């Protein structure tokens, strides 16, 4: 599917090894060693498509699917591009997962790596010429202040860095992504390690995909990130990630979030193609950093209802709180896939708002109220409106703001209350327990 189709999607980002063990997995004692395979499978994820859909997601980003070197539970350590990772299942089981998702109106986005291979023996790498030393840069330690180093040095000391300027390597990866997409029928691609490969590799690779591509450029600098924005369909919104977290963890005002939202939006071709996220598999979970479910809900209100494509990290809906990798990659079966959890029902409510408004694909995010401790905005000409704050659990405040809609009525989706703006479009609302208020006409 094309960029335009993805703009209205809502993405659940899952580690395949960490969702479900089988079609019959309805929960169990968790996985003890999070640095090793926990036993999630394609067939297990297939049995959880209803669980995912029931919160309002209509797309799943899965970690890489290719055969990996030892202990590559996360998929990022390729050893054979043209074989599936047997720990998750066979090729036919991967097709069955995708086909099951398509039958339920769900897109599958596949994560891919072109920068590097795994840490297994060179002589087991496939296909040719990946088993030749000459296919790689000599090993060097990355200096993140030097772009040459970022591109030619190793992302980790044991992960050989491909010589991506070699025409033979460029054709290997183009032919491979075309085969992958044709064979398995994926709807989109997440491109790992984009800043680690020279820019002129990317357009041909992205176009070979045949679908929307979203790139990972791990940087808070919006100028740097936006320099990749014309090479692929969208980018992960790392620039917003930083001040998003600083506001909702009570570290800074909302002004830096609004500033960065405006700045990155102005620098890319189409800010509706950016992927908005609060946490992921490479950073501690929100609740590890700030143990306050009210603040998490406020932050997630931005993720779900701001401009851009929301990307929610699996386990958020069970209030997971693990810290740095691998502790942020807890299995989901320990939670027993509780569809009555507080966070599950929260995601389900915001998913219903998105569904009733077309998946909110517009470039129509109007800042309404921007203060030390509060942020409100609307979408769709005032049809949907969010008031968020960083006051925290157990706190009450009144916030009054101009809605730009005269004499208009909304319903609070959480509290059921009727909210009416005045003749001047001014609305006052009182936040309770630090919880966000979402308003729908
Ligand atoms: C992970 C991420 O790293 C890089 O991001 C950098 C970024 O480029 C930097 O600029 C900087 O970011 C700055 C930012 O620019 C600023 O604007 C902001 O203000 O501050 C931030 C933070 O300073 O830092 C980040 C993070 O370092 C890449 O650019 C990015 O693409 C990466 N994300 C991708 C990439 C990969 C690789 O495909 C995936 O990671 C996977 O592979 C790693 C490496 O194997 C694995 O790591 C875990 O397992 C390792 C084995 C373990 N290391 C142990 C092994 C040793 C010997 O072998 C010991 O030497 C070592 O001490 C041991 O700990 C790792 O610690 C452990 O994390 C991942 O699990 C695996 O997933 C990413 O997932 C993918 O999204
Ligand atoms: O509630 C204060 C103020 O917030 C908003 O103004 C933003 C503006 O939209 C941003 O572009 C940037 O300039 O930050 C301003 C706040 O410092 C509302 O737009 C405005 O109506 C309201 O009074
Ligand atoms: Ca490289």
Author numbering: 19 to 459
Give sentences copied directly from the paper behind this entry:
The sequence of all three enzymes groups them in the GH13 sub-family 1 along with, for example, the amylase from Aspergillus oryzae (also known as TAKA amylase). All three amylases have as their hallmark a shortened loop between β2/α3 and two shorter loops in subdomain B located between β3 and α4 of the central (β/α)8-barrel, compared to structures of other fungal amylases, e.g., TAKA-amylase.
For CfAM, there are two monomers in the asymmetric unit comprising residues 19 to 459 for chain A and 19 to 460 for chain B, which superpose with an r.m.s.d. of 0.3 Å. Two conserved disulphide bridges stabilize flexible loops in subdomains A and B. There is an additional disulphide bridge in CfAM, located in the C-terminal domain. In particular, CfAM shows the highest pH tolerance, retaining 70% of its activity at pH 8. Although all three amylases were co-crystallized with acarbose, a well-known inhibitor for amylases, a complex with acarbose bound was only obtained for TeAM and CfAM. The catalytic nucleophile D190/D192(CfAM/TeAM) is in a near attack conformation poised to react with the anomeric carbon, whilst the catalytic acid/base E214/E216(CfAM/TeAM) forms a hydrogen bond with the bridging nitrogen of the glycosidic bond with the 4-deoxyglucose in subsite +1. In CfAM, a secondary binding site in domain C was identified and modelled as maltose located at the edge of the β-sandwich. The glucose units are held in place mainly via hydrogen bonds without the usual stacking interactions with aromatic side chains. The additional binding site in this domain in CfAM strengthen the role of this domain in substrate binding. In addition, a new previously unobserved carbohydrate binding site was revealed in the C-terminal β-sandwich domain of CfAM, which might be important for the initial interaction with its polymeric substrate.
